[PDB]
Amino acid sequence: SVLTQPPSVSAAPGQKVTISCSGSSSNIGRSYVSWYQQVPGAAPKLLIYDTNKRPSGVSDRFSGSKSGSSASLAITGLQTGDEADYYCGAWDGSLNVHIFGSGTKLTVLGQPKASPLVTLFPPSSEELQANKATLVCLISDFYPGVVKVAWKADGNSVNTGVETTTPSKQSNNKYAASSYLSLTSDQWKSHKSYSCQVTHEGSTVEKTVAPT
Template identity: 25%
Template sequence: MTIEQNQISVTHTGNGESTAYLRCIVHRKNYLHWYVQKNNGELKRILYIDDNDHSTIYDDGATHNKFVTVWESNVCSLIIKKIMDEDAGTYYCALWYYSIHTDINQQKHSLCKDGSIKKFGTGTRLLVIDQPPKKPEVTILKSSTEDVAKRGFAIYMCNLQNFFPDVIRVVWYVHDNEKEVESEQGDIEHNNSTNTYSLSSWIIVPISDLKMTFTCKYKHDTTKEGWGMKSVSGHEYNLETQKKRSNDMKCNEGLPSFNRMVYRAAQLTYVMLILKSFMYLPVLIFIMNKSKL
């Protein structure tokens, strides 16, 4: 039994004229419920749909003038009409059914020990505000070749900047097989002057995986039910060249950098003195022989 809510958030104005469509994808039709959570308060059920005749049964305080449900194949949409400020909140769809098994000996059905199975979607946040959504500006930063050679791994950082609203989900995948990669994430930062948000997420990539392509994927109001993405790889890292440079530097690491020119000059002077001594050697031998005579 699976249930999906692919919209992470939707944004509308609260003038009583707009309508929101919240979608819930289910792969098993049972009694479907819609809940709302406002201001981090308790979950409150709005309605549920009878699996027998697909009729909508409203809970207290909810009416068809505000909420309507529509089935299309395996998608149930909750339609919220005439949106006002008080409609803001996170809306969850849920499957709730009783699992039964057959007693072969007595040929009758009975409830399982847990009594029922409930499964909730991830939720869709309805924001009621006059500011329109703004797409993240995405850039990826990478470790330098020197850092990778020294540490034995690279860091890829996905920066998402100047987006609105602040509801966002970021994940990393291996590009070829859509395998999710363990990642770290910073806090969402708020820019008061523009009323936009920024976020960074990063992964650590060992040298053995540098040839692989990784994708930073994000879900936001501006991506609707899909994902935004940006990919990166380490194909340009030339660690063999960097290793050779490091070895060359190790050969000279005993000499302070500011004395290397002086050391070279001393070497040249020493060679010149040796050559000069060879030039005077015949003269010295002649003088020594003459003195003996």
């Protein structure tokens, strides 16, 4: 239950970008919107409040607005200092909660965008000897450093037993991430196929393994 934001927004230095935030009339429709900027491992800070007002220390390269049930954060003169995760937020006057958006990673493009290479490992024979089965989806050589990962078993979405790391840099300065589907051996053998689907910048790569 979150206001909807794009996972990734990016541009070369000095360019302008916008970040969308969509909700409904019981929140963004009727309430003021705030925006928060967070460097990972540090607390968020207030970037915009009362829909389009800037606190001290926030430059006028940043501007907020809203139209109906969507809001938007525009940034000009994109630069290193702006690289962060960005969250919108707004009171919901029907549910009486502050609702945050799903979050957008803003990247200043310092190198060629690049699609992910995906390798899916079925469970090892050693792990099946111990009655367990972890599928390991390894994702490498991508930029910018944002992916979404979905798993399926016989074509159906899998929710349980999934853990996924946050993309971080390889030694060649592209990004890698990892995702795991952890089953018992008996669960592994109960389906005909499994797939890891990786979404990056409008692309999807999907790898599949089959027990046996």
